Structures are given as structure tokens and as C-alpha cells.
Amino acid sequence: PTSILDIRQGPKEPFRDYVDRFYKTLRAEQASQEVKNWMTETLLVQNANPDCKTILKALGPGATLEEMMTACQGVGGPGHKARVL
Amino acid sequence: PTSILDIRQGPKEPFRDYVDRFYKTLRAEQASQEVKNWMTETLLVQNANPDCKTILKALGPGATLEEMMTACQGVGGPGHKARVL
Amino acid sequence: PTSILDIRQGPKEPFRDYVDRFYKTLRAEQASQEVKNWMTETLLVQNANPDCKTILKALGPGATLEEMMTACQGVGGPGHKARVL
Amino acid sequence: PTSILDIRQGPKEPFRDYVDRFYKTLRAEQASQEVKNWMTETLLVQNANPDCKTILKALGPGATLEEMMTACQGV
């Protein structure tokens, strides 16, 4: 039985794909709505890989899922590689 | 800055010592009471070491903290620690 | 008193750090050279975290440690640490 | 292809039953006999439940399989 806690973004996994896995598992998770809100607002960010997590934290609290997906969409892409270093 | 999510029982760490570290961080975590309750239900078990995690899950639901402490207490048995300042 | 069998990559532990812990324990393990060879061939992969393990297995046989680190790292990338005392 | 590394004695599992499961997986494990031998000397003890592991460690090196089974047998 796979726990939501076991869903962690892979080292080079696109954020969008991690989000799909996370929400698939979340839909199966036995937890109150309040806990699921904590899972989508906090756990999703905490279990992101170091590349995406840094980006997400800088967005600050209250970012929508859409905003998080926009923010990490470019990770591993040429724009991302080019901007550092 | 340490997240409750990152408090994980070391391979040779006495369960009671891990529980103390877990609750120390939990008290500092900024989450609702309902979320913290879920953390003691689920996250505390998830973050136990392999030797102990299997044992805890086999207890079934609703084990008291001392029953968990007892199930995973090692050289043992029950030990008592002074308060720290 | 850790065994090599106790060395497992944490869910957020950089693979490089895990490899360092693994080889530190390996150098102290009392096993034949053949068994230690097996430990770096198989045990190192088996005790990687689930997301990294899947990636490492998919590499096929004979990957170098460098190849394994690259595979379980993000965009940037290699990190660098001072030698310990 | 379950790994021998994942065969662990349950908290209420009779040691003899765990031994049976261990050796069934071991026969399927692809490793040299010397590695398999290290697995029976070390991994079998490492993956026993905590009380049994404590008992087996106290037995010291070189115990026969039947010594181990007597040591961890239930009542």
C-alpha cells in the first residue's frame, strides 16, 4: 500500500509528472480534507526534488498548483541550463 | 528549519529516542492540531527504521505511544530519562 | 555499530552522500574481496532510495560510480565537499 | 524477482518459517556460492526480528542453522 509520503519527485523527473503521481496517490489516501490540504500545500513542495523545491520556496506561501507548475516547467530545459551558470 | 518530515529513526537509534526527537520537532511545526494528529498517526510510523516500521504496522491501529515504545524497545526494557533544562 | 546492511539512502539524501557513507562502512566491513565486490555491484543499488534504485537498475550492468551519481542527481549537479579531518 | 535483502522475519513469525522463506528466495538469488554463504552467515541474522537477532548475535559466529533455530524457537 503506497503512502502519499512515499511520493517524491525523481532526480530528473519533470514536475508535471511528479504532480500526476502525487495526486493519483492523494486521491487514494485516507485523510480528512484539512490534512489533504496540508498535503497539497506543504507536502507536495517538501517532496519536490532540490532543483524544483528551491524554486517553489521562493514563490512564498499560497502559490496555486498552476503557479508551481509554471515555476518548475523549465527545469532541465535549455532556458534553465543557460540561466545558471 | 528542520521539517517534521525529515525526522527519521536512525538505523541503531532506540525508538524512544526517535520519538523524543519527533515530538520535539512536532511541537515546533506550524500545522493545525488535526494535521499534527495525523502526523502522530501516520508520519511517526512512516519515518521509523526498517526493523521498527514493520513491527509498528503489524500492531494494527490505535497503539498507544507506550505500546509502540514497548514494541520497539530493544535491549530494554522500559527506561527512564531525566528531563533536560 | 552499523553494518553495511544498515546503510540506506535517505529519501532526500544526495546519492553522493549515501555513496560516501556506504564506502566508509564498506572499508570497515569484514568480508572477502569477492563479497565486497558484490556489495558495490548489488547492495549499493538495492539500498538506494526507491526512486534512485529504479533509475540505477535501468542503467544495466557495469555502470561506474560516476555514472551512478550522474543518474541520481539533478541538473546541477555534482556538489563538492572538503575532505574530512 | 523479490530480493533476498527484503526477506525479513515478522514480529510474530516463527523463526523456522522465516528461514524457509529466506532459503527459497536464496535459491533464486543470482550470486556466487561464497556470497550466498555470507548471506546465510550475516544477512539471515541481520533480517531476523529484533529479539531473535539479539539472541543470534549472542550465539557468536559459526553457529549451525539448527543452533539458530533452537535459539529462536518459540514456546
Short mmCIF file of C-alpha atoms in Angstrom, two decimals:
data_model
loop_
_atom_site.label_atom_id
_atom_site.label_comp_id
_atom_site.label_asym_id
_atom_site.label_seq_id
_atom_site.Cartn_x
_atom_site.Cartn_y
_atom_site.Cartn_z
CA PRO A 1 0.00 0.00 0.00
CA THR A 2 1.81 3.11 -1.29
CA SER A 3 1.55 6.13 1.03
CA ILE A 4 1.44 9.72 -0.19
CA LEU A 5 4.57 10.11 1.95
CA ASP A 6 6.37 7.75 -0.45
CA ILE A 7 5.77 10.02 -3.47
CA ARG A 8 8.93 12.03 -4.06
CA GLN A 9 9.97 13.82 -7.23
CA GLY A 10 12.70 11.88 -9.03
CA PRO A 11 16.15 13.46 -9.55
CA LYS A 12 15.31 14.40 -13.14
CA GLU A 13 11.56 13.79 -13.15
CA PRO A 14 9.53 16.59 -14.74
CA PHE A 15 7.50 18.38 -12.07
CA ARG A 16 4.30 17.79 -14.04
CA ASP A 17 4.88 14.03 -13.90
CA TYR A 18 5.59 14.11 -10.17
CA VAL A 19 2.39 16.10 -9.70
CA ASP A 20 0.42 13.43 -11.57
CA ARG A 21 1.86 10.69 -9.35
CA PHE A 22 1.30 12.72 -6.21
CA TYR A 23 -2.34 13.44 -6.97
CA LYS A 24 -3.03 9.86 -8.04
CA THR A 25 -1.82 8.69 -4.66
CA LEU A 26 -3.57 11.55 -2.86
CA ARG A 27 -6.90 10.52 -4.35
CA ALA A 28 -6.42 7.13 -2.69
CA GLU A 29 -5.12 8.49 0.63
CA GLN A 30 -7.40 8.14 3.65
CA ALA A 31 -7.20 11.57 5.22
CA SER A 32 -9.52 14.43 6.12
CA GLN A 33 -9.86 17.37 3.76
CA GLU A 34 -7.83 19.52 6.14
CA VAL A 35 -4.98 17.01 6.07
CA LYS A 36 -5.20 16.70 2.29
CA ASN A 37 -4.94 20.49 2.07
CA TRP A 38 -1.73 20.28 4.10
CA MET A 39 -0.57 17.57 1.72
CA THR A 40 -1.13 19.67 -1.41
CA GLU A 41 0.14 22.95 0.08
CA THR A 42 3.09 21.68 2.06
CA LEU A 43 3.95 18.02 1.42
CA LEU A 44 3.96 18.44 -2.38
CA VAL A 45 6.59 21.16 -2.05
CA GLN A 46 8.64 19.35 0.58
CA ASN A 47 8.83 16.17 -1.53
CA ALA A 48 9.89 18.02 -4.69
CA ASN A 49 13.49 17.48 -5.78
CA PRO A 50 16.17 20.01 -4.85
CA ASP A 51 16.01 21.73 -8.26
CA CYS A 52 12.26 22.38 -8.12
CA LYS A 53 11.95 22.79 -4.34
CA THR A 54 14.27 25.80 -4.25
CA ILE A 55 12.19 27.44 -6.98
CA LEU A 56 8.93 26.69 -5.22
CA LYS A 57 10.07 28.01 -1.83
CA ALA A 58 11.00 31.35 -3.40
CA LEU A 59 7.42 31.72 -4.65
CA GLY A 60 6.42 32.00 -1.00
CA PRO A 61 3.25 30.70 0.68
CA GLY A 62 -0.08 30.36 -1.10
CA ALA A 63 1.09 29.65 -4.65
CA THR A 64 -1.54 27.78 -6.68
CA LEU A 65 -0.72 24.41 -8.21
CA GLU A 66 -0.77 26.18 -11.59
CA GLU A 67 1.81 28.68 -10.35
CA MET A 68 4.01 25.88 -9.05
CA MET A 69 3.76 24.00 -12.34
CA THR A 70 4.66 27.15 -14.31
CA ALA A 71 7.59 27.81 -11.99
CA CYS A 72 9.17 24.37 -12.40
CA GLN A 73 8.13 23.71 -16.00
CA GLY A 74 11.52 24.72 -17.36
CA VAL A 75 13.72 22.64 -15.06
CA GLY A 76 16.18 20.56 -17.07
CA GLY A 77 15.39 22.66 -20.12
CA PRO A 78 17.73 24.87 -22.09
CA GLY A 79 16.42 28.09 -20.55
CA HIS A 80 17.21 26.64 -17.14
CA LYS A 81 20.68 25.38 -18.10
CA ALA A 82 21.53 28.69 -19.74
CA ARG A 83 20.48 30.85 -16.77
CA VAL A 84 22.87 29.01 -14.43
CA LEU A 85 25.64 29.24 -14.90
CA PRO B 1 14.31 24.93 9.77
CA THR B 2 14.14 21.13 10.10
CA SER B 3 10.80 19.78 8.91
CA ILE B 4 8.96 17.11 10.89
CA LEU B 5 9.09 15.22 7.59
CA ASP B 6 12.86 14.88 7.99
CA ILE B 7 12.88 13.34 11.49
CA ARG B 8 13.77 9.72 10.73
CA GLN B 9 14.80 6.95 13.14
CA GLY B 10 18.47 6.12 12.70
CA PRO B 11 19.42 2.51 11.92
CA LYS B 12 20.58 1.84 15.51
CA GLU B 13 18.63 4.60 17.25
CA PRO B 14 16.44 3.50 20.18
CA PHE B 15 12.77 4.06 19.27
CA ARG B 16 12.22 6.09 22.45
CA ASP B 17 15.00 8.47 21.39
CA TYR B 18 13.47 8.89 17.94
CA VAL B 19 10.05 9.50 19.47
CA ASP B 20 11.53 12.27 21.61
CA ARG B 21 13.14 13.89 18.56
CA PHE B 22 9.89 13.51 16.63
CA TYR B 23 7.76 15.19 19.28
CA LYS B 24 10.33 17.97 19.80
CA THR B 25 10.04 18.95 16.14
CA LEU B 26 6.28 18.35 16.07
CA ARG B 27 5.82 20.91 18.84
CA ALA B 28 7.65 23.45 16.67
CA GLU B 29 5.84 22.54 13.45
CA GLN B 30 3.30 25.10 12.30
CA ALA B 31 0.34 22.98 11.28
CA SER B 32 -3.16 22.63 12.67
CA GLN B 33 -3.94 20.27 15.54
CA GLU B 34 -5.72 17.98 13.11
CA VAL B 35 -2.64 17.78 10.89
CA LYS B 36 -0.35 17.15 13.89
CA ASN B 37 -2.70 14.36 14.98
CA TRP B 38 -2.35 12.78 11.53
CA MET B 39 1.42 13.16 11.85
CA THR B 40 1.40 11.08 15.05
CA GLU B 41 -0.92 8.53 13.39
CA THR B 42 0.97 8.07 10.17
CA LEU B 43 4.21 10.04 9.80
CA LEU B 44 5.64 8.71 13.07
CA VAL B 45 5.32 5.16 11.74
CA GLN B 46 6.45 6.04 8.20
CA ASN B 47 9.72 7.52 9.46
CA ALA B 48 10.68 4.63 11.78
CA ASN B 49 13.66 2.48 10.73
CA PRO B 50 13.18 -0.83 8.86
CA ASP B 51 13.45 -3.02 11.98
CA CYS B 52 10.82 -0.94 13.81
CA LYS B 53 8.44 0.15 11.00
CA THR B 54 7.45 -3.45 10.19
CA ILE B 55 6.77 -4.11 13.87
CA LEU B 56 4.63 -0.99 14.33
CA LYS B 57 2.49 -1.66 11.26
CA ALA B 58 1.85 -5.20 12.48
CA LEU B 59 0.34 -3.86 15.72
CA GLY B 60 -2.75 -2.69 13.94
CA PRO B 61 -4.42 0.63 14.53
CA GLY B 62 -4.61 2.64 17.73
CA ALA B 63 -1.47 1.50 19.52
CA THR B 64 -0.69 3.93 22.34
CA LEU B 65 2.67 5.67 22.22
CA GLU B 66 3.85 3.50 25.12
CA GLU B 67 2.71 0.32 23.35
CA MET B 68 4.69 1.41 20.29
CA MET B 69 7.55 2.34 22.61
CA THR B 70 7.22 -1.16 24.12
CA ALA B 71 7.00 -2.97 20.77
CA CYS B 72 10.19 -1.33 19.51
CA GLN B 73 12.07 -1.03 22.83
CA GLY B 74 15.27 -3.00 22.34
CA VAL B 75 17.92 -4.02 24.88
CA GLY B 76 15.33 -2.56 27.18
CA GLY B 77 13.04 -2.81 28.69
CA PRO B 78 11.38 0.44 29.72
CA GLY B 79 13.95 3.10 30.56
CA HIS B 80 13.59 6.48 32.26
CA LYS B 81 15.42 9.67 31.29
CA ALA B 82 15.86 12.84 33.32
CA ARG B 83 14.31 15.98 31.88
CA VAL B 84 16.80 18.28 30.19
CA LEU B 85 16.72 22.01 31.02
CA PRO C 1 27.68 -0.29 15.46
CA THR C 2 26.41 -0.09 11.89
CA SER C 3 26.58 -2.93 9.39
CA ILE C 4 26.91 -2.18 5.68
CA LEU C 5 23.40 -3.67 5.56
CA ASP C 6 22.23 -0.69 7.64
CA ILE C 7 23.45 1.90 5.13
CA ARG C 8 20.41 3.02 3.11
CA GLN C 9 20.00 6.24 1.13
CA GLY C 10 17.62 8.65 2.81
CA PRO C 11 14.57 9.85 0.86
CA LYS C 12 16.21 13.31 0.40
CA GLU C 13 19.82 12.23 0.86
CA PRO C 14 22.04 13.16 -2.08
CA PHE C 15 23.30 9.99 -3.74
CA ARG C 16 26.87 11.23 -3.37
CA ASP C 17 26.44 11.45 0.41
CA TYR C 18 24.97 7.96 0.51
CA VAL C 19 27.86 6.57 -1.54
CA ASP C 20 30.28 8.22 0.89
CA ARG C 21 28.55 6.62 3.89
CA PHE C 22 28.40 3.28 2.09
CA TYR C 23 32.12 3.20 1.23
CA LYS C 24 33.12 4.36 4.71
CA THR C 25 31.26 1.39 6.17
CA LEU C 26 32.46 -0.89 3.36
CA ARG C 27 36.13 -0.22 4.12
CA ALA C 28 35.45 -1.39 7.69
CA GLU C 29 33.31 -4.41 6.78
CA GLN C 30 34.90 -7.78 7.42
CA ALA C 31 34.02 -9.72 4.29
CA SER C 32 36.10 -11.24 1.49
CA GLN C 33 37.00 -9.15 -1.54
CA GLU C 34 34.50 -11.14 -3.60
CA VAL C 35 31.72 -10.35 -1.16
CA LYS C 36 32.71 -6.67 -1.07
CA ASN C 37 32.64 -6.67 -4.87
CA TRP C 38 29.07 -7.96 -4.66
CA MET C 39 28.30 -5.23 -2.15
CA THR C 40 29.26 -2.49 -4.62
CA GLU C 41 27.64 -4.35 -7.54
CA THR C 42 24.33 -5.16 -5.95
CA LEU C 43 23.91 -3.96 -2.37
CA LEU C 44 24.77 -0.32 -3.21
CA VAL C 45 21.93 -0.33 -5.76
CA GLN C 46 19.48 -2.26 -3.60
CA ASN C 47 19.88 0.15 -0.69
CA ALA C 48 19.49 3.31 -2.76
CA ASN C 49 16.18 5.10 -2.21
CA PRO C 50 13.28 3.78 -4.29
CA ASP C 51 13.35 6.48 -6.95
CA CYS C 52 17.12 6.28 -7.43
CA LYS C 53 17.13 2.47 -7.27
CA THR C 54 14.74 2.24 -10.23
CA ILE C 55 16.99 4.58 -12.20
CA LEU C 56 20.16 2.65 -11.30
CA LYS C 57 18.69 -0.72 -12.25
CA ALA C 58 17.64 0.64 -15.65
CA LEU C 59 21.29 1.54 -16.39
CA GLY C 60 22.14 -2.10 -16.93
CA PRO C 61 25.30 -3.78 -15.62
CA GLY C 62 28.69 -2.22 -15.04
CA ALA C 63 27.87 1.43 -14.52
CA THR C 64 30.70 3.44 -12.94
CA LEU C 65 30.15 5.20 -9.61
CA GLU C 66 30.31 8.46 -11.56
CA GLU C 67 27.62 7.22 -13.95
CA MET C 68 25.51 6.20 -10.95
CA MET C 69 25.94 9.63 -9.31
CA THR C 70 25.02 11.45 -12.51
CA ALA C 71 21.94 9.27 -12.90
CA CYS C 72 20.68 10.02 -9.39
CA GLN C 73 21.45 13.75 -9.40
CA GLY C 74 19.59 16.74 -10.79
CA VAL C 75 20.64 19.33 -13.37
CA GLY C 76 23.40 20.99 -11.37
CA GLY C 77 24.61 18.69 -10.36
CA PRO C 78 27.83 17.49 -8.83
CA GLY C 79 28.47 19.12 -5.45
CA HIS C 80 31.90 19.36 -3.82
CA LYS C 81 32.94 18.73 -0.23
CA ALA C 82 36.13 19.31 1.69
CA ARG C 83 37.99 16.23 2.87
CA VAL C 84 37.13 15.43 6.46
CA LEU C 85 39.89 15.90 9.09
CA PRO D 1 12.33 -11.02 -8.55
CA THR D 2 11.99 -10.13 -4.88
CA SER D 3 15.39 -9.54 -3.31
CA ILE D 4 16.86 -11.70 -0.56
CA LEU D 5 17.57 -8.30 1.04
CA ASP D 6 13.84 -7.88 1.59
CA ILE D 7 13.13 -11.18 3.34
CA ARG D 8 12.59 -10.09 6.95
CA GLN D 9 11.22 -12.09 9.87
CA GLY D 10 7.82 -10.85 11.01
CA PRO D 11 7.39 -9.81 14.64
CA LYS D 12 5.25 -12.89 15.31
CA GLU D 13 6.66 -15.12 12.57
CA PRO D 14 8.19 -18.40 13.76
CA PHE D 15 11.92 -18.34 13.02
CA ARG D 16 11.70 -21.65 11.16
CA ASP D 17 9.12 -20.17 8.78
CA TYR D 18 11.33 -17.16 8.11
CA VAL D 19 14.26 -19.49 7.47
CA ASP D 20 12.13 -21.37 4.92
CA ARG D 21 11.22 -18.16 3.09
CA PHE D 22 14.81 -16.95 3.27
CA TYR D 23 16.21 -20.07 1.65
CA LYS D 24 13.52 -20.21 -1.04
CA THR D 25 14.46 -16.71 -2.13
CA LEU D 26 18.16 -17.51 -1.71
CA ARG D 27 17.92 -20.40 -4.17
CA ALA D 28 16.65 -17.88 -6.76
CA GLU D 29 19.24 -15.24 -5.88
CA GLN D 30 21.85 -14.80 -8.57
CA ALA D 31 25.14 -14.61 -6.73
CA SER D 32 28.14 -16.86 -6.23
CA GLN D 33 28.02 -19.56 -3.55
CA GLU D 34 30.51 -17.57 -1.42
CA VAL D 35 28.16 -14.59 -1.47
CA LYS D 36 25.24 -16.87 -0.68
CA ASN D 37 27.28 -18.25 2.20
CA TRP D 38 27.88 -14.73 3.52
CA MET D 39 24.14 -14.18 3.14
CA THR D 40 23.36 -17.18 5.37
CA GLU D 41 26.04 -16.15 7.90
CA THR D 42 25.19 -12.47 8.09
CA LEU D 43 22.07 -11.40 6.19
CA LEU D 44 19.90 -14.13 7.72
CA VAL D 45 20.80 -12.81 11.19
CA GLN D 46 20.52 -9.16 10.15
CA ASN D 47 16.97 -9.65 8.88
CA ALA D 48 15.64 -11.60 11.86
CA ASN D 49 13.23 -9.74 14.15
CA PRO D 50 14.89 -7.77 16.98
CA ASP D 51 14.56 -10.38 19.78
CA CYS D 52 15.80 -13.17 17.55
CA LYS D 53 18.62 -11.04 16.14
CA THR D 54 19.72 -10.26 19.70
CA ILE D 55 19.73 -13.96 20.56
CA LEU D 56 21.59 -14.96 17.40
CA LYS D 57 24.24 -12.29 17.87
CA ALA D 58 24.83 -13.62 21.38
CA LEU D 59 25.38 -17.11 19.95
CA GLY D 60 28.52 -15.80 18.28
CA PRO D 61 29.99 -16.62 14.88
CA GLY D 62 29.77 -20.06 13.30
CA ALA D 63 26.51 -21.33 14.77
CA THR D 64 24.82 -24.05 12.73
CA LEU D 65 21.39 -23.43 11.26
CA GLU D 66 19.88 -25.81 13.82
CA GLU D 67 21.61 -23.96 16.66
CA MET D 68 19.97 -20.78 15.35
CA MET D 69 16.57 -22.40 15.10
CA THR D 70 16.79 -23.77 18.65
CA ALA D 71 17.92 -20.34 19.84
CA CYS D 72 14.95 -18.51 18.32
CA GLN D 73 12.29 -21.21 18.68
CA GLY D 74 9.06 -20.16 20.35
CA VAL D 75 7.13 -21.79 23.18
#
